[PDB]
């Protein structure tokens, strides 16, 4: 598929609404050209990522994205299949889903979105097999999340 | 042994179906589940009522009258099962009939069959 | 209740009182099948044969409850003293074709 | 069976079909349906296996209590039993009851309490609880404290009353309100009730001496008014009740003189069966000492019922304890081995074993077939 | 066979303990007492609840998910008794545990064990 | 036994003595008393045999209902069980209850109804119903509709209440008001109640990974606060609760490396036993495929519990399904063969078979001994 | 009663209404364990895995009686319409560590 | 023993109280010298015997001496052991027993007593073995009584 479309529908995501305040980075450039998010498992990133998650997401998805008002984000079943990938997970956050899960470009810079994705990806409790978003070395040091 | 051959009583082993006081026993030897030859296991009720038989005692050569009283109020023991019918007669002759559950008279109207005891009630040669 | 039980265990035949009211049990029967006695008498059954036998009155005859008497064996006895007047029917628990009656007048 | 339902099952799958489980219904009652009861050696709870003797398939089962008395209506509209259960397995408060079951679903149709626990607890004798021939009344025997037969109305589903009877045993109903009993003295008693006080009772004459011992399992074909009643020697008494009164037919001898000289005698549990259409007698026999009458036997003799003519002698090959027959034109000879807990189904004509159904409880002893129409 | 050797499934006889859909069956094959592979005998109640197993079908080479539902409300059949534990896990993992009486959800709260059926509920290779 | 009571019986007679029948009393409980329970393959009514392991004599029995949970007080003052019965054998109204029995007369002392039928009906796991160590309270597990343990006051003979518990299984009581459970997640939960609202619940840490499978029959010596818990491979976890808190001791390996290389694994029902005075572990083992864990096994390994030092390896000679030991100075190794329905009693030191008690129901599976004093 | 049962048999996943209130059951859990809905809404559960699962409310939650729902198998659905407001807790009958809740406000 | 004594006691029976009206016969002479009663099973006697019995004895012992107010006289158990014999049975009737079973010499001639004895002996239902009162030929044609 070519890259970025709204997951329920308005199809092409529109990047002219994003804040310029953070679309500059090597992470955002790399991901926009390749669909690969370099923050996954980045020990550097992960403490900001966890706070981005708690401020914006734990209300509905719970503390460890195990689910509360809205669904769990911590295993291999994704209501929208695309979310097995960072392109799709990104498309869910930029674009929005339905309900109270709206578009997130008006509160988060593009590079903050990829940092939050990496915390979602860190909260996964399945095993590195369906951890398709991880490279081999990232899989090799990945541990199923334990609260 | 051949089940159809004649009964040869012995007086050496009481848990054996050919132990001489067991010539018209139906059911289970009480001694195999906590009773003796003449007494019920713990927890069972003793019937007063019985079928009888005259059994030849190969040791002292006399026939004795055995009163096959049941111990009752328990499910069957499932151990030392014998059926001997020496001198056993149809149900219309109840005093020598052994397919009847002889539990009458046992405390609290206990009527399930656990085992049979083999007391001697008198000589009858 | 209409009968007192004097000894609740069979006792031996040769201890039955001098000239007592006696029903012999022999040849699979109660040899005096319709005894008449007076209010206050004691009946003693005595089993003359090897085959154990007893006396059993059912519920509502002597009392609220049935009296199944003790099994007697050869030459044992067992008594009952009738305190009310009436026809009391009994049979033998292992052998219910063996029957009798005490008539207390 | 396996192979058959496996190539079925397997291919069901290669054709794509997934399974939507349900509770089956038993095939409608036919003449090849045979009932095996397992008294389980006096265990407090028992089983009855419903088998299709043709296919040699268990097709249902029923649970019961201590030492129950199975009954099958001849016309196949129900099966019932009188049973005993206790609040704490084998002790506690006793409940005696009759349950009636539908014969396609095996579900209970009536459950009727019998007051004051009056059933007689004996090794199972098929003729100690009996249906009257219209199927609306069940009669059962009470031995203590006094001989009596209770009357259960299966139609308004209730216990009616106990009938005082003399010192007589087994119940052979000949009409809605009449049945016969065999007495201690050697006579048969006829009991007519509906005579709403006490029944009207009549004795026939004494028909067998004090020292002739008639078995606990007589065969009775109620549609033929015929009672076939062996003795420990294989002498067969036959009484015909089809008039309403007992007519004593001639006593046939079931064993040849040479067999009685060589020590052949009947032995088993349900030792006799009577086919009514062919009018024939099958008897279980072997060589035995006099007093080894309850043991299994390895042969079967067949004789003409009218003449006493020996038709055949089968060599069964297993140790059989009870026999019975289907009541159709080309019948099966059902042979049950308590020790094998297996039912061998033989051709009644030739004695050739055709099928077996094993694993039939812990102590199976009684076979019951319906004489249909 | 040696009871300890590995399970070799067959797809030729459903009453046999090695019939392939029976790799984690505990109890008694329903077909042996009036049921089929997938249906309860007359008079028994069908549970909704089950332990499961993935059984390799030697004929078409796929593993299938078997849902071992019990037929309940009767004493055990006593015929075709098998215990297979392929992929069976302790009681703290209840979804693959087979010593539990899976009679939940059966009509009239029927809870005694008669037999187990072996319906296929989906593929799981 | 026979010969002994025959020369007795016989001579009793040649000395003139006639028999006055009575109901016997069981000899007072000793350390050689061993209890065998026969679940009878999920039959609706079951038996427990009371045996004197020394003389190899059945000395009493008890009847029970569907799939009961036997319990023996360690000090020998009672035995009890929690049980299930039904008004019509296997269907009808359910009654779950606890009965308490005196251990000399075998007569019931209390019969306590458990409301709303809450027992868990599982193949029998000795630690799913448990006595607290003072013997005044029985706790039993409920699985559906939600994990819970009920509390039965055996002293004022009544059911008290159900305790909501997390997704944890088995009940190992360490005090009048505390017990441990092993949870789905791999942790042990400590439950303190008498905290009269909800209990106080604590988890230990996870002590075994998701793919290590601990058996359904752990051994627990309550007088030693010791839980010996094998895995499918024979790795033995041991937890010590004698402080009130779970301390995880070192995991010993029960099979040698050569035995695991040659395919030896534990298999059976009650696969482990722990002698507390000698502090030793006995494990049932044989060569088996990975997933043939519930099958009988022919050897027994003995190891030191502290070191993991293998002390002995017995060649049992029969197919054993469960083991247990008396808790005295010179102990017996009780080996039960469900298939033989026989209890072999061996010397625990040498493994030498000494006695056997056969004909022990239809499917015997559980052995229970009291750790006396 | 506080819930109407719309179809009492599971029906297939690809027949769930366009944009319905849906709880997926996958990886041994109820993926939206605390759903809030309004009085009048229909919840549909859909079981995304092979392992059969159901929803079971006990007695006194939806009605006098417990509702054990039908077992769903892969890609089957099952709905309930809540007519009173309240917190209704449920678990899965074979697997009681699987829990959820509908909050109807 | 020498012959005739009262069975409970006054011991010697006194024959001076008997009626002379029937002590003359061959039966009474034979029995008094030998203790043997020739009327047993005498087809000649037996119809008078049966009427003597019904008039005097069935009231208390019943119709077939099976028992009623007083005991059965029809089997091998005799409360007084002597009654296995005709000497003793005679002694019970002449002399009396206790109660309402008094002496019978004031209603019956000696030869009527032996005729009644023979009906009692005919009413026996045991078997010729304990039919010690019968000779071999009398045993040989003896049939246990059937009502
Ligand atoms: C509560 C008001 C929410 C906030 C804030 C966020 N999410 Fe959410 N999310 C919510 C709902 C009700 C739903 C369902 C929408 C639907 O159409 O079904 C979701 C869904 C998602 C998803 C999709 C899940 C899937 O299985 O495919 C994702 C990836 C997701 N939400 C992520 C997420 C993150 C990372 C958030 C913080 C930036 C976040 N959500 C906030 C409700 C709410
Ligand atoms: C009723 C008023 C009686 C009449 C008339 C006769 N008998 Fe009787 N008899 C009666 C009683 C109450 C007893 C018992 C006496 C006792 O001491 O026990 C008897 C006993 C006998 C006996 C003895 C029985 C025994 O078993 O030994 C005999 C032989 C006897 N009676 C004979 C008999 C005959 C032949 C009678 C008619 C001439 C007769 N009795 C009349 C009461 C009564
Ligand atoms: Cu008697
Ligand atoms: Cu589930």
Give a written overview of the molecule.
The complex is a heterooctamer, with two copies of chain A (147 residues), two copies of chain B (125 residues), two copies of chain C (105 residues) and two copies of chain D (373 residues). Chain A has 147 residues and is mainly alpha-helical. Chain A has a single domain (1-147), classed as Cytochrome c-like domain (Cytochrome Bc1 Complex, Chain D, domain 2), CATH 1.10.760. Chain A has helices spanning 26-34, 46-56, 58-61, 86-95, 110-122, 136-140. In chain A, α2 crosses α5. The longest helix of chain A is centred in the last third of the chain and has 13 residues, at 110-122. Chain B is built from no helices and six strands. Chain B is globular. Chain C has 105 residues and is an all-beta fold. Chain C has one domain: Immunoglobulin-like (Sandwich), CATH 2.60.40. In chain C, 0% of the residues lie in helices and 47% in strands. Chain C has strands spanning 3-4, 11-12, 21-26, 29-30, 35-37, 42-47, 56-57, 67-68, 76-82, 86-92, 95-104. In chain C, β3 (21-26) and β4 (29-30) form a beta hairpin. Chain C is globular. The two termini of chain C are 16 Å apart. By secondary structure, chain D is mainly beta. Chain D has a single domain, classed as Methylamine Dehydrogenase, Chain H, CATH 2.130.10.10. Chain D is built from two helices and 30 strands. In chain D, the strands form seven sheets. In chain D, strands 16, 17, 18, 19 and 20 form a five-stranded antiparallel β-sheet that branches. The interface between F and G is small, with 7 and 7 residues. Bound molecules: heme C (2 copies) and copper (II) ion (CU) (2 copies). The PDB classes it as electron transport. Keywords: electron transport.
